[PDB]
């Protein structure tokens, strides 16, 4: 296993070296501020190059994939799944908000805050949206712009960019590859920083445990953050997913589960949604009935755009920061890390190795420091296994679904 | 009239109900600031999605007309034709200036503010002109950065691009397409946004009447806004463009206005431009003897980019909103609104649906609020009616001086 | 010889007259400073419309240049003397800022510059790069945002992007051409405004001898700065190129001196290194034994990419500059310095008309004031006529250095 996925074992290697190195240097003296930086500077390196690739990364991915946005995905059977994907995964990315100011892991006006939210959804410069933000000062009141890069309203002028260049057709053709290539090369970029990723994680983590202060309560919060991440998984798959499948559905959602129960033992095991693929075509369309011409556009979409366990992670990992550094968000970055969430896990798995730049993204949303991110790739290899399990049942649940929102029609279209 | 054209009847309606709204709530009591805000919020809404498409607006527009220029345009045909329609329009706007700084209604050195405007047209970052301006700040003098879009240096700039590009030929195709595609694109967004204006406007209308702490003297200014701009038309058109007429073609000027008085007229009465084609072609080549090879390419081309009325109501309506705020524009800024309404003249009617982004590209250019723009749209329809008479005239005017300056050559390539 | 290339005899032209105006003008009273900077005036638009062009400058000319990098390039035969290209002119450019600091015309710690450079090769965000810089500041350390392109940070991303779509293939097509066209777009307009540049230039220079308030002891800087441009071009040349030669060829490397003398008279002579082509070829090809398969590879790429006496003087001219203004460089400048100068020898015999914005370059990567500069261009003339003659013989050096490199490999490939 030191041959094949020679990048998960690298990082492992990495965060235990880091750790071991940490805690050995700790114990010398107390070591010099200066030094500590220049021991964490490669992290720092590693930080910077992939938050220069967020502006070209989003640019170039809202506009490649709202531009294959077809009406001809076997009829109403592609929206109706569509509006099952962004429902579900917005209420785990809120439910995850929920239990994060629950528990409380790591221990301006509302008006006026959600006046700034809806002004900086409509920017008024591009350019200047790229690198800086708008807030209410008060001495009245008056405008006055703050840094920070404003991801929603890039997103959201994008996503109206890319939803009028697809309605253009063949006419705008020119502009959807052009844009398309640029993709691939942002992506290539997105594959090498990442192989420098062992290198810096590691001295991060250094420098995380040298100037920590104190290391009985930083572990009793990575312990209590990892039970509120559970807690969730465990709240939005068991509780809601059945709920959600019996007020529409109408029938027994125990059934599925006792269907689908290899499936999820796959997703387990194996720790990857694209690869349980073959089981749970084999447990939806042979053990519940599906027909299979709702399942074979179901799972294949929803395996990479339903990622309904890595939506609940980000909102609760991004206000456990936020937390730690003592920063209390008011209500108009809460609504930021939802939306942020919901944005970042549809794209983590279309973005092959970007499951530490999505983070960055909602961080720099809201704006906090990322220097805690190394602490979240330390326990990252004890809640991917389940989060797994919880997007493999998301999209079984949504196959089972579909298929009772179309039975008239492919009855009819049979006939 | 109420299924055709659904557009200025809806922005019609909307201002009825915004004053009708104003004038019943501010009757109840002193009304809150945070709730006028509340209130006025979605027209600041509205004219943040305006503002954050003139950057593009610019760039598209100027690459894909300056793309479009052709030495076989009927030989000199065109380019005498385009020596006209720059020349009348910049003096109707100048005129407009000169109507505005004498009738006055709404009641640095000069040499720094020419050098400022110099160095403006001149940027040194093209990032930085996208967003920011430059000026002299006093104690040694000393350069500083203020905020602000620099419009007239992003205009200079892509005019030489386009030129440098339109030179290339064939070889710059994938360019030009590009821009080209890109083009529709922005279009399709202003678009859809004016379609919530009759909403947004209403508000902002009631966001003007419930704090304006005075209705006797803004109704005075507002009226001798109208009476200026009504001065400037009849002064432009019937004393300058028969002038002008007589000083080159040198013949009588009212034969010419007898000649097209029924396009006149019907200008007046279906307010549009383009619709007055078919009755001022069966004036000008019927009634005054014109050569069917002029007025074909004077006539289309002077209906889009030949707006004389347009350039006028541009620069009186800026200076007349700088004059409401108090604002004392210095010299450098006058001729910055001479130049930006002749630019947004042409752009007026070349991009369709813009009556109103044209206003803010000024406003934004010399740097003045834009919620007083909402006045502006409550009295539009009693002046668009005879500022497309102007434009009318202006374009009969041109065809009846090209064909004068122009007679020899045509009587040569006939025989 | 003033109808042949009528833009050097232009320049000198208006240096000449800049200086008979200014020694003219400086005679007859203390001359108000408002009026000085209206005179001075025209050379400052000159400066900000070639500053306007750096960055797309650099954007189209690194994704073009490295786009055409070909692993078909005579096999080895390339690479080889690409290693050579970049090495050379590295150590001249290097040694050239030991000579501008030990001679010294004109008359925060090293870790914190060092970790600001690192930082600034890495920038977090793309659009903030084009017009601002990261520095340390001090009371805990904290970093700042200062003004400044951040030309390294641009450079490094987009030679990252030029790599990563040169190995997409033919895939990122439509891309590469795009462009390649801006190429000559920007490239047309370096063109027209160089076409200024004998009237700017002209005032600049009278801007410099109405208010120097000393002509002895500037014309004695001016002075001492050529003697170390030329100390500096005979140490590179003489002792190193002919000592990088026998440590590396292993034979007489005054013989090569023999050989050669031809062409470094003809370079001498003509004054440029394309034209010194047909009489260097006969030189190394019959004169020394040199194969042909080797020399019409490594003199063509040579001519226009190994500029080794460039490099020497862009680094020598920037630091002296900056020794003129009083500003003390740190070692965070120096090694920017060094860099840049490489990148801009390579450009400034690629792209035409571009020995005025190379220097800019440098000037606004270090943020230097640029009025000093037009000192530099009425010395010129004295030193590029010996620069050409460094850029030869390092040229013929490096194809007699690849032949022996390459003389087993051309051997075997024979039979
Ligand atoms: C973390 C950041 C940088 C990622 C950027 C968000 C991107 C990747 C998100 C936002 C909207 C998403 C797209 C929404 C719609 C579709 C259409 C579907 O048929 C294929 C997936 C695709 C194309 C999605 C791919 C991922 C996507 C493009
Ligand atoms: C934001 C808006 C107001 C600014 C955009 C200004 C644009 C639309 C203006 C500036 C210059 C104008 C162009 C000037 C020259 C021509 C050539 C003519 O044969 C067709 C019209 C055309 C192509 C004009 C179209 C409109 C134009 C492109
Ligand atoms: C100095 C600033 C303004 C411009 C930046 C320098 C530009 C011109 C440099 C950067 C990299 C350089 C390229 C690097 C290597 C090669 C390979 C050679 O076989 C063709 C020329 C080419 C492609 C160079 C052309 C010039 C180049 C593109």
Known sequence: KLGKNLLLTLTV???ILGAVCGGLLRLASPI????????????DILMRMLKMLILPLIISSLITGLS???????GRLGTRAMVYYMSTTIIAAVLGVILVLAIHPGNVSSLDAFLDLIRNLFPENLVQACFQQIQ??????????????????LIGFFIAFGIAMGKMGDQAKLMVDFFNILNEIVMKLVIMIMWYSPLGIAC????????????????????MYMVTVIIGLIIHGGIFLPLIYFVVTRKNPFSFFAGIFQAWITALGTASSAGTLPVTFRCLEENLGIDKRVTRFVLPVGATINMDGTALYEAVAAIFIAQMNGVVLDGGQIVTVS?????????AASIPSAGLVTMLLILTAVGLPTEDISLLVA???????????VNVVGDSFG???????????????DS
């Not at 294959?68 to 076997?74: I, M």
């Open 399 to 413: 196959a089972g679904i579909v298929y009772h929102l179309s039975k008239s029609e492919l009855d009819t279209i």
């Open 339 to 347: 939306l942020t969430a919901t944005l970042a896990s549809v794209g």
């Open 136 to 153: 209410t000062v008060t001495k009245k009141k008056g405008l006055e712009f703050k840094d920070g890069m404003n991801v929603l309203g």
């Open 13 to 15: 290697f990495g965060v």
């Open 32 to 43: 010099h501020p200066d030094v500590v930086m220049l021991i964490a500077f490669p992290g």
């Open 379 to 389: 326990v990252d290899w004890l809640l991917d296994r389940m989060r797994t399990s």
């Open 204 to 223: 991060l983590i250094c420098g995380k445990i040298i100037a920590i202060k104190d290391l009985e309560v930083v572990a009793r919060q990575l312990g």
């Open 68 to 74: 294959g946005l077809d009406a001809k995905a076997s």
